[PDB]
Design a protein around this nucleic acid. Structure first.
Ligand SMILES: Nc1nc2c(ncn2[C@@H]2O[C@H](COP(=O)(O)CP(=O)(O)OP(=O)(O)O)[C@@H](O)[C@H]2O)c(=O)[nH]1
Ligand SMILES: [Mg+2]
Ligand SMILES: [Zn+2]
Ligand SMILES: [Zn+2]
Ligand SMILES: [Zn+2]
Lengths: 57, 177, 101, 650, 176, 47, 57, 115, 100
DNA sequence: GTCAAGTACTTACGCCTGGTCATTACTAGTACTGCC
DNA sequence: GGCAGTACTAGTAAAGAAAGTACTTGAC
RNA sequence: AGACCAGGC
């Protein structure tokens, strides 16, 4: 059930966690470059809910 | 589906009529750039006369009739038309509403007539005065819009494409309102 | 050329008095006979309609019956035929009435 | 499309009608009855969804036309729904006529003279009589003798106004239906339905009818009459109701009011004179699609059945449970109540399955998509496969900039020149160059990949040697041995030459100059398109990785439109303002500042080098068959020209 | 029983017959129609007579030579209506068709109608008292009620007409 | 809203003349705009 | 075979069939071969009926 | 450009059945054309040049008694760098069903490449 | 035999009514940019299907260049049926229409 | 009859190339083995 | 030697931060 | 043929 979470990114929770999004938690480390590869371990994200949103603030 | 018909009268695909003439004068935007550039067309008279060829284009035309009614209205509007628009019982339509501008030579719009008679009055310049006004009315008639032009696509692309270039509401929120 | 000819052009057969894209179908011929194109909707059953040897045709099941041979081929897109398949599942009927009758 | 295969018949119109249950029992190939799709050993079971009478399925001949997979069109079948159920496309209008109607005299609850007032205003709107419908309304507790005199003069005014307008050249007997009479008809039916729904008593016989309730779909309820006004139904001398009884009411209401509902359900005059029926709003028979249109998806072993077979199985599963619930009633309180309370639940689940097959958002129980939701949005059917389509004979590649191209041409790669091909029919003026093309083969520009014979047959040149291929070059211009194909000639699908036409396209196509018709010039080296710099501002195309489309037109009606009408030379001025979109951009503008300067002086070898580097008379840029020059600006000490005098003789 | 129908047919016209539009309607449509059973008339077309192209504009005369053909937008083939007379041999039931006997076999008495059309008289149509001999030299002859072989002509009422196959056949009967 | 205009067409029993460019692509007709706004007729010399 | 290039698109009998006598058939067959010979398997069979209302093989 | 795909012969069966697909060549009349690409194990040689249509591996099938071949489904040519024999881990010792093969593709800088 | 005879007369009475005579036509005497692109395209389909060419072939093998040459000497035997929005039509031949 | 907030069904640039993971519980059955 | 317990097997059943109109139920 | 993810212009 952790291998399903890491290979898909989908969150399966019955006591639904404090954060809003339910998918997009794991991302393939590319190793397409080394500037690409170290950039995965320093990137921050706000949420997938904030992506499909109309505001700009 | 709105498009120029063979009546020079733009209308929808099902047959309902949007306008009686495209822009009020039925002239194509891609052909009306040098239409009122009269100082350019006078300097290039003998070279523009070749591309319109006035002598070979008289037999399929009515040169005689639209010019007379364009003088009945030009003389009427200089005499009248000091009063405002609600008083004007006009008694005479322009030659576009009575004569086909794609067939009748001299059936031009009224801004084209009032700017040619304003240009050619001021300056007096082997081309005489009447061979220049006979070649602009041929330049006007060839610069008519062709029947079948997908006008409303062009009219809606001319608003949607410049909209990408973008104490009252303003811009693309104003166009949505 | 783009939206019709080089994408999904088909010359499907249309029943002329039904105006139906996906009703008419190939008749199963006899030995030496020819397979005509014929309609399912405006063709009556043979035991229902009790003939001149040319209005009579037969399915593959053996259901021999007599009726609609008023049909012709019209160039349509194939997605129009898929539209009628979905829209007749809704209970909606389309009559593609053709001009040469 | 094949220009050597005509068609004489054309669709003129369409019209949307309701597909009745009597037709789709005669239309049907074979009724399918059990909810098993395919049994063991990979065969389709007879009587199920995948059947051989519904079309050829998976390397097996059809049982209706006897054809294989490539030639069977697929056939219509049906199921027999045992009870009449609600069609979800018409339930919002079925619930209007189920309401607003008397359950005792079976008219509507309006008075019969005001229902007649809309029966003959809508008749005047079927014909082109938008103005005579208002003169009709200018005609005027009450005894029922003068009301017949009122209904007479209103009916005689219509029969005189229709007779006058059809005689005075205005309206056909098929009626006139413009746009502004669609306004006055939609305004009149919406007013008629709004006034039907607001009635207390039936104004024909004055007593109440119980109001119906719709909470959600799949069910209808009627409410009990109030404890106060039961007195009105004793001086005339909640409940779930069945869909057979809802149909039994409206099979009487539409018969007692046939003379009115013929005009509500027709925009144009009914020349067929068919009855309008309550069976229109119900569906006693589902139509299964042809099995060609519901073939299963396949990804290796991962084969899944189609979503419609999952939805049509659940209707067949309920359609057999509802018959097995009729076993005890066929044999016959406790033995009667448990078999009836489970039968009524089958009525709701067969409705909830016939809704979910048609509309997925009218389901309940992430849901399986119905037949409405294959049509609605982007990724539908009208917008994904009708207004926009995938096309044949079209390439896409990255563009690279290119001078030395004549501003109306595109530079095509060799590997686009090999794959894209054009049908040339052989004639007396082709067998010099179209015999040479078929000798060259599929992999030698300019060549050919196929020959289409007169019979519709098609011979590929790919797996052929040159000795086999020169023999077919002597087969092209031969007289046909078939009389039935004597006016047809062979088509050689030659490669794209330098004289063909090409339609280029960069997304987003914000205006029509972003999709122009260019000429062609093939290039020997690399795999990219080559665009001249005067076209780079019309497509809004830069060269940091833009790729843009290349559509190759396939007949002479389309070659004559992207050379004369959709041409790139006709698109100099845009129709937005009348301003040009075409011109030189970055290096050429910086060079004319230096060339047309006063400092630019050129000697005789320099001056004549820049002219032949741009004119080149043999490609047809000059108009004199000899390059004329000017006398120099300076004659002493040595002759010099000027960059003004470059562009003068250019 | 040769009969005359004037018909109206809607036919194509290839561009190789643009200079000869009357010749192209005949060769493409009318000449493959003679000596075949046509379904929409009821017999076998013998020949055609009086081909007239209906002109597309009605404002011209039928006396005119130059006519108009409406070109399909997709294909270069034109389409037009045309009038022509067909003389068509139609047999129906109940008629009496004089035929020339072609097959001497014990199964069916084959006979050619007008020396071109196949026909036959079935054995169940033949009555009991008309017998057949066992010829071993060559398939013999039919001994009728008069006690003589039949050869040459044999008139008969028509029972049925076989139209589905390649050529037409006349299922005939000898009893009335 | 495809199946809202669909129901309003089949309730009206609405016949349409296939005039609009969106209605001549569904059924595969030449448009009535521009090049398809007329027909082409061929003068044949013989009657 | 059986194409719009071979067959008519729509075929209609325009008027009712009326029976012709023997003289109009012999006038036709002497005139339909006259225009056509000046489908040769059918001309080989049209002469068999032309030599039927006149004589006998 | 290094591209790797896994050819696996045991994704169409379950639970202890006889393995119907074996690497290598059977005893039937299979065409001797593809000795150039493949070794006697039904596995390709290291370093060989493979265009579209060449076989990636040869396997004998038991339910059909025929040596099928899978093939290289790419329009761009490549060279075979390494072939891995992924062996299964179980108490029952098993013939190989899984092979990983790495391709190298020469990306010489053509025009239209982004720098 | 009786219904088609009546239906043919209605099909030809209501097609003569839609026909504007040659002296009462009032559209443009010029050949538009859309009529030129279809005359050259329809003729080039005919030339490639072995229509009798009325002009001399000076080595040109492109069927569209031949129809452009035939338009220069007005040797195209085609007629434009200019449709009015009523459903009525005007018959303009190519030899009557003047270019540019 | 009616205003009136409240409840409901709708769109939300174009197309282009990749990659991934995509039914689970359980339930009854035939077979394996420990046993006396 | 055959009985019954488990461990498996393959088998068939359930799976929360945007704009507008339109219908309509609320009180009076 | 969807989901999610990474890009291109
Ligand atoms: N419709 C879309 N067009 C795009 C998109 N991204 C890029 N483009 C097109 O590609 C072009 C890219 O231009 P840019 O976004 O880079 C603006 P920039 O300041 O970089 O212009 P330059 O500095 O002149 O290069 C632009 O003309 C757009 O028409 C997109 O997401 N959608
Ligand atoms: Mg860019
Ligand atoms: Zn039918
Ligand atoms: Zn079939
Ligand atoms: Zn009542």
């Amino acid at each position: 059930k952790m291998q399903y979470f890491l290979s898909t990114g989908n969150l399966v929770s019955q006591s639904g966690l404090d954060l809003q999004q339910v998918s997009g938690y794991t991302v393939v480390a590319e190793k397409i470059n080394f500037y690409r590869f170290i950039s995965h371990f320093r990137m921050v994200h706000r949420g997938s809910f904030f992506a499909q949103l109309k505001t700009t603030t | 589906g709105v498009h120029v018909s063979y009546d020079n009268s733009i209308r929808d695909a099902d047959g309902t009529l949007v306008q009686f003439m495209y822009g009020g004068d039925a002239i194509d935007i891609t052909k009306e750039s040098h239409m009122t550039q009269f100082e350019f067309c006078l300097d290039n008279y003998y070279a523009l006369l070749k591309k319109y060829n006035p002598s070979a284009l008289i037999e399929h035309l009515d040169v005689e009739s639209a010019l007379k009614y364009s003088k009945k209205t030009l003389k009427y509007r200089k005499k009248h038309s000091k009063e405002p628009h609600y008083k004007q019982s006009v008694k005479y339509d322009p030659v576009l509403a009575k004569y086909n501008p794609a067939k009748y030579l001299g059936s031009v719009s009224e801004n084209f007539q009032d700017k040619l008679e304003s240009f050619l009055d001021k300056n007096s310049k082997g081309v005489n005065e009447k061979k220049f006004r006979a070649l602009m009315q041929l330049k006007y008639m060839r610069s008519l819009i062709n029947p079948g032009e997908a006008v409303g696509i062009i009219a809606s692309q001319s608003v949607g494409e410049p909209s990408t270039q973008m104490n009252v509401t303003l811009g693309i929120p104003r166009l949505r309102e | 050329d783009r939206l019709l000819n080089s994408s999904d052009y088909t010359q499907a057969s249309v029943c002329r008095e039904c105006g139906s894209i996906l009703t008419t179908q190939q008749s199963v011929p006899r030995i030496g006979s020819i397979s005509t194109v014929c309609c399912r909707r405006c063709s009556m059953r043979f035991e229902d309609a009790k003939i001149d040897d040319s209005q009579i045709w037969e399915d593959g099941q053996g259901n021999k019956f007599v009726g609609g041979n008023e049909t012709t081929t019209v160039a349509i897109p194939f997605v129009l035929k898929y539209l009628d398949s979905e829209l007749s599942a809704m209970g909606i009927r389309l009559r593609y009435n053709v001009e040469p009758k | 499309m094949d220009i050597s295969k005509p068609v004489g018949s054309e669709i003129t119109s369409v019209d949307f009608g309701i597909l009745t249950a009597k037709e789709i029992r005669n239309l049907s190939a074979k009724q399918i009855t059990n909810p098993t799709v395919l049994d063991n050993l990979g065969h389709p079971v007879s009587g199920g969804l995948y059947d051989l009478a519904l079309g050829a399925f998976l390397r097996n001949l059809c049982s209706t036309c006897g054809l294989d997979e490539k030639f069977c069109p697929g056939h219509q079948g049906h199921i027999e729904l045992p009870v009449p159920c609600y069609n979800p496309l018409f339930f919002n209008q079925l619930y209007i006529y189920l309401r607003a109607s008397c359950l005792f005299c079976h008219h509507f609850r309006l008075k019969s003279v005001e229902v007649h007032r809309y029966a003959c205003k809508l008749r005047l709107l079927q014909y082109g009589l938008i103005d005579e419908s208002y003169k009709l309304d200018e005609i005027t507790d009450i005894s029922s003798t003068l009301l017949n005199e009122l209904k007479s003069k209103r009916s005689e005014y219509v029969d005189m106004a229709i007779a006058k307008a059809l005689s005075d050249g205005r309206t056909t007997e098929r009626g006139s239906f413009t746009a502004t009479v669609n306004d006055e008809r939609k305004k009149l039916v919406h007013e008629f339905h709004k006034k039907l729904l607001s009635r207390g008593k039936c104004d024909n016989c004055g007593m109440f009818s119980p109001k119906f309730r719709k909470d959600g779909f799949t069910k209808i309820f009627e409410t009990a009459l109030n404890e106060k006004q039961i007195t009105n139904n004793r001086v005339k001398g909640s409940t779930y109701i069945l869909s057979t009884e809802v149909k039994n009411i409206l099979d009487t209401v539409f018969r007692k009011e046939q003379c009115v509902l013929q005009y509500v359900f027709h925009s144009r005059p009914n020349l067929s004179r068919k009855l309008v029926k309550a069976d229109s709003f119900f569906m006693d028979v589902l139509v299964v699609p042809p099995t060609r249109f519901r073939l299963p998806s396949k990804l290796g072993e991962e084969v899944h059945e189609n979503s419609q077979n999952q939805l049509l199985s659940k209707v067949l599963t309920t359609s057999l449970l509802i018959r097995d619930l009729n076993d005890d009633l066929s044999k016959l309180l406790e033995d009667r109540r448990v078999i009836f309370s489970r039968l009524m639940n089958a009525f709701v689940t067969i409705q909830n399955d016939v809704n979910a097959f048609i509309d997925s958002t009218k389901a309940q129980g992430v849901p399986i998509p119905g037949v409405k939701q294959a049509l609605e949005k982007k990724e539908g059917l009208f917008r994904k496969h009708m207004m926009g389509k995938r096309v044949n004979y079209a390439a896409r590649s990255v563009i690279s900039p290119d001078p030395n191209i004549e501003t109306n041409e595109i530079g095509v790669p060799p590997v686009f020149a090999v794959k894209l091909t054009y049908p040339e029919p052989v004639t007396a003026y082709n067998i010099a160059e179209l015999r040479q093309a078929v000798i060259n083969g599929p992999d030698k520009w300019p060549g050919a990949t196929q020959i289409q014979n007169e019979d519709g047959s098609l011979v590929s040149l790919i797996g052929m040697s040159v000795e086999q291929r020169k023999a077919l070059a002597n087969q092209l211009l031969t007289p046909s041995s078939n009389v039935s194909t004597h006016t047809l000639n062979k088509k050689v699908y030659r490669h794209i030459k330098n004289r063909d036409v090409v339609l280029m396209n960069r997304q987003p196509t914000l205006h029509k100059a972003s999709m122009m018709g260019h000429k062609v010039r093939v290039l020997p080296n690399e795999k990219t398109l080559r665009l001249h710099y005067a076209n780079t501002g019309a497509y809004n195309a830069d060269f940091d990785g833009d790729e843009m489309n290349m559509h190759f037109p396939q007949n002479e009606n389309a070659r004559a439109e992207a050379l004369n009408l959709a041409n790139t030379d006709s698109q100099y001025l845009t129709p937005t303002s009348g301003s040009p979109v075409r011109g030189l951009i970055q290096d050429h503008i910086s060079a004319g500042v230096w060339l047309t300067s006063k400092d630019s002086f050129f000697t005789r070898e320099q001056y004549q080098q820049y002219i032949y580097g741009c004119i080149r008379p043999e490609d047809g840029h000059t108009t004199r068959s000899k390059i004329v020059t000017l006398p120099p600006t300076i004659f002493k000490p040595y002759p010099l020209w000027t960059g003004k005098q470059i562009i003068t003789t250019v | 029983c040769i009969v005359r129908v004037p018909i109206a047919l809607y036919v194509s016209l290839a561009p190789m017959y643009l200079e000869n539009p009357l010749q192209g309607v005949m060769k493409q449509h009318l000449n493959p129609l003679v000596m075949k059973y046509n379904n929409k008339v009821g017999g076998v077309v013998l020949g055609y007579e009086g081909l007239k192209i209906l002109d597309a504009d009605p404002l011209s005369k039928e006396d005119t030579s130059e006519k108009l053909i409406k070109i399909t937008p997709d294909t270069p083939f034109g389409f037009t209506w045309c009038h022509v007379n067909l003389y068509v041999w139609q047999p129906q039931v109940g008629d009496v068709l004089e035929g020339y006997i072609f097959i001497q076999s014990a199964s069916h008495i084959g006979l050619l109608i007008h020396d071109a059309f196949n026909a036959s008289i079935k054995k169940n149509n033949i009555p009991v008292d008309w017998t057949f001999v066992h010829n071993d030299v060559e398939l013999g002859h039919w001994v009728d009620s008069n006690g003589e072989p039949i050869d040459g002509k044999l008139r008969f009422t028509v029972r049925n007409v076989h139209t589905t196959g390649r050529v037409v056949s006349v299922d005939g009967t000898l009893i009335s | 809203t495809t199946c809202q205009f669909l129901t309003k067409a089949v309730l009206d029993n609405e016949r349409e003349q296939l005039d609009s460019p969106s209605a001549r692509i569904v059924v595969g007709k030449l448009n009535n705009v521009g090049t398809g706004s007329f027909d082409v007729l061929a003068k044949v010399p013989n009657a | 075979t059986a194409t719009t290039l071979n067959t008519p698109v729509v075929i209609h009998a325009t008027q009712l069939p009326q029976h012709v006598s023997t003289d109009e058939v012999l006038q036709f067959l002497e005139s339909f071969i006259d225009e056509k010979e000046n489908l040769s398997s059918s001309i080989s069979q049209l002469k068999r009926i032309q030599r039927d209302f006149k004589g006998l093989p | 450009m290094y591209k790797t795909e896994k050819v696996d012969l045991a994704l169409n069966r379950n639970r202890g059945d006889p393995i119907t697909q074996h690497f290598g060549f059977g005893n039937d009349e299979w065409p001797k054309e593809w000795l150039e690409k493949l070794d006697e194990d039904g596995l390709p040689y290291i370093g060989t040049y493979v265009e579209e249509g060449d076989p990636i591996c040869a396997y004998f099938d038991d339910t059909l008694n025929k040596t099928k071949i899978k093939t290289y489904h790419s329009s761009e040519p490549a060279y075979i760098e390494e072939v891995n024999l992924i062996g299964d881990e179980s108490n029952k010792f098993q013939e190989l069903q899984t092979v990983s093969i790495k391709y190298r593709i020469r990306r010489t800088p053509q025009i239209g490449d982004k720098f | 035999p009786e219904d088609f005879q009546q239906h043919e007369q209605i099909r030809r009475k209501t097609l003569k009514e839609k026909a504007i005579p040659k002296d009462q036509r009032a559209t443009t005497p010029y050949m538009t940019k859309y009529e030129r692109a279809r005359i050259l395209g329809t003729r080039a389909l005919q030339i490639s299907m072995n229509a009798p060419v009325f002009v001399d072939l000076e080595g040109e093998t492109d069927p569209l260049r031949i129809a452009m040459k035939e338009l220069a000497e007005k040797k195209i035997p085609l007629v434009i049926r200019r449709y009015l929005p009523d459903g009525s039509f005007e018959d303009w031949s190519v030899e009557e229409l003047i270019v540019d």
